[PDB]
Motif scaffolding. Structure first.
Motif, PDB file in Angstrom:
ATOM      1  N   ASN A  14      55.478  34.926  22.424  1.00 34.15           N
ATOM      2  CA  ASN A  14      56.368  34.083  21.613  1.00 34.15           C
ATOM      3  C   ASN A  14      56.662  34.848  20.323  1.00 34.15           C
ATOM      4  OD1 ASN A  14      54.536  30.994  22.324  1.00 34.15           O
ATOM      5  ND2 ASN A  14      56.437  31.760  23.252  1.00 34.15           N
ATOM      6  N   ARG A  16      56.583  38.021  19.725  1.00 32.52           N
ATOM      7  CA  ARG A  16      57.406  39.201  19.964  1.00 32.52           C
ATOM      8  C   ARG A  16      58.810  38.856  20.465  1.00 32.52           C
ATOM      9  NH1 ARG A  16      52.773  41.288  23.578  1.00 32.52           N
ATOM     10  NH2 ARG A  16      51.086  41.607  22.040  1.00 32.52           N
ATOM     11  N   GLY A  17      59.201  37.593  20.319  1.00 34.71           N
ATOM     12  CA  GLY A  17      60.515  37.164  20.758  1.00 34.71           C
ATOM     13  C   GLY A  17      60.826  37.366  22.229  1.00 34.71           C
ATOM     14  N   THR A  87      63.638  40.075  25.904  1.00 37.95           N
ATOM     15  CA  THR A  87      64.177  39.345  24.768  1.00 37.95           C
ATOM     16  C   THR A  87      65.594  38.938  25.201  1.00 37.95           C
ATOM     17  OG1 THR A  87      65.162  41.320  23.686  1.00 37.95           O
ATOM     18  CG2 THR A  87      62.885  40.776  23.130  1.00 37.95           C
ATOM     19  N   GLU A  89      68.363  39.633  23.624  1.00 36.52           N
ATOM     20  CA  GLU A  89      69.236  40.789  23.417  1.00 36.52           C
ATOM     21  C   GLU A  89      69.136  41.674  24.637  1.00 36.52           C
ATOM     22  OE1 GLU A  89      71.659  41.488  21.701  1.00 36.52           O
ATOM     23  OE2 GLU A  89      71.527  40.385  19.833  1.00 36.52           O
ATOM     24  N   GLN A  92      70.860  40.068  27.575  1.00 35.08           N
ATOM     25  CA  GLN A  92      72.300  40.076  27.347  1.00 35.08           C
ATOM     26  C   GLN A  92      72.873  41.473  27.644  1.00 35.08           C
ATOM     27  OE1 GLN A  92      73.738  38.177  23.685  1.00 35.08           O
ATOM     28  NE2 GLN A  92      71.645  37.379  23.471  1.00 35.08           N
ATOM     29  N   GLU A  93      72.110  42.525  27.320  1.00 33.83           N
ATOM     30  CA  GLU A  93      72.539  43.905  27.534  1.00 33.83           C
ATOM     31  C   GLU A  93      72.477  44.351  28.979  1.00 33.83           C
ATOM     32  OE1 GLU A  93      70.894  46.909  24.858  1.00 33.83           O
ATOM     33  OE2 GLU A  93      71.033  48.390  26.469  1.00 33.83           O
ATOM     34  N   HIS A  94      71.313  44.192  29.592  1.00 34.33           N
ATOM     35  CA  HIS A  94      71.120  44.627  30.969  1.00 34.33           C
ATOM     36  C   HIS A  94      71.539  43.662  32.055  1.00 34.33           C
ATOM     37  CE1 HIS A  94      68.661  48.049  29.341  1.00 34.33           C
ATOM     38  NE2 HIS A  94      68.547  47.172  28.363  1.00 34.33           N
ATOM     39  N   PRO A  96      74.348  41.097  31.482  1.00 33.69           N
ATOM     40  CA  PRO A  96      75.420  40.347  30.815  1.00 33.69           C
ATOM     41  C   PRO A  96      76.085  39.294  31.700  1.00 33.69           C
ATOM     42  CG  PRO A  96      76.218  42.468  31.537  1.00 33.69           C
ATOM     43  CD  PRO A  96      74.726  42.516  31.638  1.00 33.69           C
ATOM     44  N   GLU A  97      76.239  39.628  32.973  1.00 30.35           N
ATOM     45  CA  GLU A  97      76.843  38.731  33.955  1.00 30.35           C
ATOM     46  C   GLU A  97      75.965  37.470  34.092  1.00 30.35           C
ATOM     47  OE1 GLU A  97      74.631  40.869  34.696  1.00 30.35           O
ATOM     48  OE2 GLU A  97      75.359  42.801  35.424  1.00 30.35           O
ATOM     49  N   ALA A 100      75.637  35.025  30.922  1.00 34.50           N
ATOM     50  CA  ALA A 100      76.836  34.210  30.761  1.00 34.50           C
ATOM     51  C   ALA A 100      76.852  33.059  31.773  1.00 34.50           C
ATOM     52  CB  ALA A 100      78.086  35.079  30.928  1.00 34.50           C
TER      53      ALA A 100
ATOM     54  N   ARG B  16      62.600  43.200  18.034  1.00 38.26           N
ATOM     55  CA  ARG B  16      61.619  42.118  17.824  1.00 38.26           C
ATOM     56  C   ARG B  16      62.150  40.707  18.120  1.00 38.26           C
ATOM     57  NH1 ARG B  16      59.560  42.027  12.114  1.00 38.26           N
ATOM     58  NH2 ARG B  16      57.501  41.478  12.960  1.00 38.26           N
ATOM     59  N   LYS B 165      80.886  37.134  25.492  1.00 33.30           N
ATOM     60  CA  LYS B 165      79.952  38.208  25.848  1.00 33.30           C
ATOM     61  C   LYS B 165      80.051  39.406  24.904  1.00 33.30           C
ATOM     62  CE  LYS B 165      80.748  39.448  29.948  1.00 33.30           C
ATOM     63  NZ  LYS B 165      80.643  39.263  31.431  1.00 33.30           N
ATOM     64  N   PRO B 167      77.349  42.260  24.425  1.00 31.92           N
ATOM     65  CA  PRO B 167      76.082  42.983  24.482  1.00 31.92           C
ATOM     66  C   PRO B 167      75.960  44.124  23.466  1.00 31.92           C
ATOM     67  CG  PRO B 167      76.993  42.688  26.654  1.00 31.92           C
ATOM     68  CD  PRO B 167      78.090  42.423  25.681  1.00 31.92           C
TER      69      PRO B 167
END
Lengths: 190, 190
Positions: A14, A16-17, A87, A89, A92-94, A96-97, A100, B16, B165, B167
């Motif tokens: 928790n 470490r987000g 996390t 982020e 969302q990065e790896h 993204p599909e 969403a 983080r 979106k 990222p």
């Protein structure tokens, strides 16, 4: 009787987000467990059943009580599958599909290899059955699990379900009644 | 003309799971700053203007391009006010009512002493008009900022806006055309 719902004290993850996983309590996570015991004591309860998931963060917080407790697998946190221990982020990065798509139907979406709230609600049927025919019970569970249990007792739609307020270190004292359920929110500041 | 939108390489706070702040690029965040310079060079763009916000993570990423860039205060990330640098768990715990009101209306909502997307869209107005009267522009910014620029070019509504979106490590090449705007998303894997 009352049903006390709260989740494990703050975990390493928790802190470490990051989501899911099976990490242990942080320093103040442990301090919450002690504060929880003092709260349960201050309630003047003669008999109380304590339920925990199989995850270490719930077991450890229960350890601080000093009383016996039962471990239910059905109380394990929602499985984010591939996204476990990442996390937002990162997801969302790896993915993204996926992210969403998860945002457009939070109740039914499952991350790859994961569970949906809908699945969780399903595996929680027997936990609710038991709760409904027991006296005082304390459920030290997880945010997603706690949201599903709370939606049931507070008659919330599956749309409201994933967004139900379920912070860390807050005990929800529920007292089922003839039709609804009373609610009281206790913040254990630590 | 082409408008390139991307955000700073992954920051220390990104790693983080904390929002806002003014941390710098993380190790792989720098590796993105480098890969972005490679992508930009191989695009062979004529007189590319490079805009940056006044925050470290943004200037730092532009620094690896070789070419000069300008800084706009207006491109600074949305201010989360009192929730600055907090994880989502933290804001849900210390600011449970606030967190809930946000999910209700993410466009108009302001954290205690913070900004709303509506506020952001406002200060970005002079950025959009300049962006409009330009040729090729690479805008290295932030998530909330990117969402606002993107919403404008892609003709999105205020509701869709906070959920667009955006990222990390992904460049969005927009090409304003007669019927609207064509889009190309390039993921820079590092």
């Amino acid at each position: 009787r009352s049903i006390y719902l709260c989740r494990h004290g703050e975990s390493e993850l928790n802190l470490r987000g990051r989501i899911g996983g099976d990490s242990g309590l942080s320093a103040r996570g442990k301090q919450y467990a002690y504060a929880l015991a003092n709260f349960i004591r201050s309630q003047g309860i003669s008999s109380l059943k304590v339920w925990t998931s199989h995850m270490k963060r719930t077991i450890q917080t229960a350890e601080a009580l000093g009383v016996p407790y039962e471990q239910w697998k059905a109380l394990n946190e929602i499985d984010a599958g591939v996204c476990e221990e990442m996390t937002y982020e990162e997801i969302q990065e790896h993915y993204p599909e996926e992210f969403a798509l998860r945002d457009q139907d939070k109740y039914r979406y499952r991350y790859p290899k994961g569970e949906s709230y809908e699945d969780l609600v399903q595996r929680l049927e027997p936990v609710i059955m038991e709760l409904e025919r027991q006296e005082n019970v304390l459920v030290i569970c997880h945010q997603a699990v706690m949201r599903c249990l709370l939606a049931y007792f507070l008659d919330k739609s599956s749309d409201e379900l994933p967004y139900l307020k379920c912070p860390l270190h807050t005990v929800l004292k529920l007292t089922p009644v003839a039709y609804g359920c009373r609610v009281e929110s206790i913040y254990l500041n630590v």
